Amino acid sequence: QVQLVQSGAEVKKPGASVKVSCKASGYTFTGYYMHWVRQAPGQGLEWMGWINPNSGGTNYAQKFQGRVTMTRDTSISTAYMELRSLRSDDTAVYYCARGWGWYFDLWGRGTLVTVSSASTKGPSVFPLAPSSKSTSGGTAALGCLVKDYFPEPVTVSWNSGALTSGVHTFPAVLQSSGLYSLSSVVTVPSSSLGTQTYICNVNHKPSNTKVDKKVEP
């Protein structure tokens, strides 16, 4: 199988450096250039550079010259991208892509690199209680508020994944505090508020935080 496997997500302070790895398999690693493309959350794709795995020769985008270094280790078919002097706007998913010429036909799954002065922190989970203010027709709305965590991502399930219909989990927002926040909501029949319990399950792996929060009227 033809595959590119990248190293895990990183969390860095501004001014630090990160080295991402990209191991190829299923093809001759030295017969194709390897490119690095990054994508900031909610934004477009940005080409960084390429490396010729057979020569080590490189070519970097102008805005990365002197900060980035791409290398390879053919004995283990791995490509490396080191970005130094990290700044917050370097927060992005970094992809390695095989260069079938200038066509990127094989991609890695990406590596999230977060650059912020914030320290890893688990979320506070607060209920968004239902009431008359959250009732329309026979349909009520309830949710959980996952506030002040760093870095991305968090996952939210309801009743351990037994409740899926009507669920809306919003993309995280980066608050001016440097911490993230999101809410998860679900609409249910207003008659089941007295018979069916509702628990949101929040998991924030980066800080190994697991919180179950019962949401009551």
Partner: protein, 207 residues
């Protein structure tokens, strides 16, 4: 340095024909234009190379065509899997991306408001949440009013991806205040506007 794609957003129903445009840069040759698809949480996926040749495995409803600087990606019959973001590429230059969304009938939002929890108030902060549920199109406006005074700069909003079942959007707007500020005021309200609403909808509560 960034290629131009049009439109920014294309709204169509499944089974319709989609045409996306990309204007290559004149400084560099255009014979090597490529198109990519990207779905949420996934790496981009090569669709078209050489301006008009399909990548392996790509269904034949995708086709490419191009002159010297104007290139087009055509999807003949949109399947529900085809709605995503599409990028063009020319050497080291990527396009700004075009989002292909499902077009449905206009649906006005259902507005709900949530006060802060007593738990959060114990810590010294108060978050008020205004929920706009299952609406279309994506454009909406939320205005916060505390004791009938317009707020600004203390709210952030988030929007879901298009719902896979009913193709609607949902929007969250969170007003953040300190406990002290929150307890100085009485009425908290969010006013919602949307092309499906004949008049603004207001939801409020009394601390």
């Amino acid at each position: 340095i960034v290629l131009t794609q049009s439109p920014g957003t294309l709204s169509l129903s499944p089974g319709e024909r989609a045409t996306l445009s990309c204007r290559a840069s004149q400084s560099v040759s255009s014979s090597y234009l490529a198109w990519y698809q990207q779905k949420p949480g996934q790496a981009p996926r090569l669709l078209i190379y050489g301006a008009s040749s399909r990548a392996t495995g790509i269904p034949d409803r995708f086709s490419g065509s191009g002159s010297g600087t104007d290139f087009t990606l055509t999807i003949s019959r949109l399947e529900p899997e085809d709605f995503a973001v599409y990028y063009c590429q020319q050497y080291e230059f990527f396009g700004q991306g075009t989002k292909l969304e499902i077009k449905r009938t206009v649906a006005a939002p259902s507005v709900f408001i949530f006060p802060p929890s007593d738990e959060q108030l114990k810590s010294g902060t108060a978050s008020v949440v205004c929920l706009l549920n299952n609406f279309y199109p994506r454009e909406a406006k939320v205005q916060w009013k505390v004791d009938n005074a317009l707020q600004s700069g203390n709210s952030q909003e988030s929007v879901t991806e298009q719902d896979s079942k009913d193709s609607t959007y949902s929007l969250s707007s969170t007003l953040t205040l300190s406990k002290a500020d929150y307890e100085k005021h009485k009425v908290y309200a969010c006013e919602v506007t949307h092309q499906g609403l004949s008049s603004p909808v207001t939801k409020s509560f009394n601390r």
